[model samples]
Target: SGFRKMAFPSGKVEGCMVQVTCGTTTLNGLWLDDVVYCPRHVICTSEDMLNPNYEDLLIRKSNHNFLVQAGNVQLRVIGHSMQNCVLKLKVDTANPKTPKYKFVRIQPGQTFSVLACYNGSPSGVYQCAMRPNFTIKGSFLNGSAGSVGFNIDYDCVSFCYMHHMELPTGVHAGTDLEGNFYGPFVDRQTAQAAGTDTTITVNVLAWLYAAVINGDRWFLNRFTTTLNDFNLVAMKYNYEPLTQDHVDILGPLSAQTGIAVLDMCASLKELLQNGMNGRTILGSALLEDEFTPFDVVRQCSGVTFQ
Candidate 1:
């Protein structure tokens, strides 16, 4: 049942806002138009009270899905009482061997969605999870208060391949001498001497090149590259992944840009790391030592960001 309207000195509790303590709950797939009031506030205050603050609010659960062809895909999840909550999506190719899942952080009172490409695979499963930040008073919220849990699931399909083109190629393809096509280009000694910021910059350059060659312009521009002009182009592509033809184009484009093949590869590598792990190549002081190329890319990229 929906909430009943209550009168207040100002007018009514109809428009008053409420906050959800559970970060891991999902609302209905559609927009939630009603304002939720905290149970504590609702009980303690009279109908005529104005701006009553509630300690507990209504809780709900639901599921959703989005589809993307070879191009871009976005899914919007909306609801109420979402403070202290985190929204995440787990995506996997019908084949689990191709692991792909991305966690999306929800802005209080805002809708959340993700963007990605179908590549050759066009079908995927997306499961959404919402949970409260650890520090928040999570037990007071609904769903979390009892045996009920908060989670949602949805499936999506894609048809068209977005920009999926325009990324650069590296000098070597596949694995390198180190037995890692994705390992650090700079050795630990070199990185330490160069400093964290310098190391990050170098890594970023490497990632840029790899992405370009992989025809991952949509991926690079979306997850890396701060250039405003490139960002506009990325927006046009909706930040989807690139295709093989797109990577091929980069060979000629590199000659025109005067950017070395090695440099581009470095940047592409860094972008992959940053995008997948939700880690920035240059910003955080706390992440200097904890950073690893594998984790960074793993956390950043994939089915989130449309």
Candidate 2:
């Protein structure tokens, strides 16, 4: 379908555009070289979308054998499922009784982000790999519960670490976006003590929720592409797909970065109480608490300059 051009008088944003193709109708979209670009002011929702199914925007991978590199990963509940089901990360070397990190619980109609297999070293050289020894599965009841079934979608790109500062640590991973949205995080208590509703943690947690729970593709795409841009700045690294390594050294190192980010997100969520009411997604209040205290973290350890 051809996009319709809009010409308005004054107060026009050159690049502020939105294109919605719900069957034959195209509204306020600009077509350049057959590519739709948003211009001026426009807002779109699932209601205005053609084939609004976000599922098509995602890919499903089997839990039996899956690999997570450096990018955004999501998990969803599948089939004859039960609520409060747990998902645990299993490493072959670890005792069967214990998993790699804290387990997350799942509920039906629920999807959350998984921060898996990332790395940061002074060597500025590392491979983000998920060896066969590492496995993730859904379990019922507790963190140590039995194996249950589920599906996953991982969109990974060639990850390059320019510096150890971008490594997943307790410190904040700053973003280039205005307001420094992902800048330093101050807990609710700390903000209250300082008489500041000015903390970034709340909005960040809200943004994370919007990306994860709401499946807001704009934020998700921005989050992913920004990280990939960081890799672009570091032209030293070549793009390589992670293959099985018998030594299993890289997997552990990658897991360390992944786990650290997840831990930080979880603690931050609790500290801010799901970004408070104002920061919460409009329709997500009921499901907010249902979130598993998880969100994507910058795999590269540095400010996202792009």
Of the candidates shown, which would achieve the greatest TM-score relative to the real structure? 1
Model 1 worst lDDT run, 10 consecutive residues: 158-167
Model 1 lDDT at residue 75: 28
Please provide, for model 1 over 119-234, each residue's C-alpha lDDT reduced to its tens digit, 9 standing for 90 to 100: 22212111111111101111111111111111111221211000101112211111111112111221111211211111232223333433343444443332334344333443
Backbone clash total for model 1 is: 60
Per-candidate TM-scores read 0.17, 0.16
Name the regions of candidate 1 deviating beyond 4 angstroms.
Answer: 1-26, 31-243, 246-263, 266-280, 284-306
Per-residue CA lDDT of model 2 for 1-306, tens digit only, reads 111111111111112112222233222221112222211011223342322222322223223322211112211212111111111222222122221121223322122221111110011111111111111111111111111111122321111110001212222111110111122421111221111111222223333433443343222221222323422422222212111231142223325334222332343334234334344333333322222222222222221311
* Residue pairs with clashing backbones, model 2: 16-38, 16-39, 16-40, 17-38, 17-39, 18-38, 165-301, 166-301, 166-302, 167-301
Clashes counted in candidate 2 amount to 10
Residue 51 displacement in candidate 1 (angstroms)? 43
Give me the displacement of residue 27 in model 1, in angstroms: 2.8
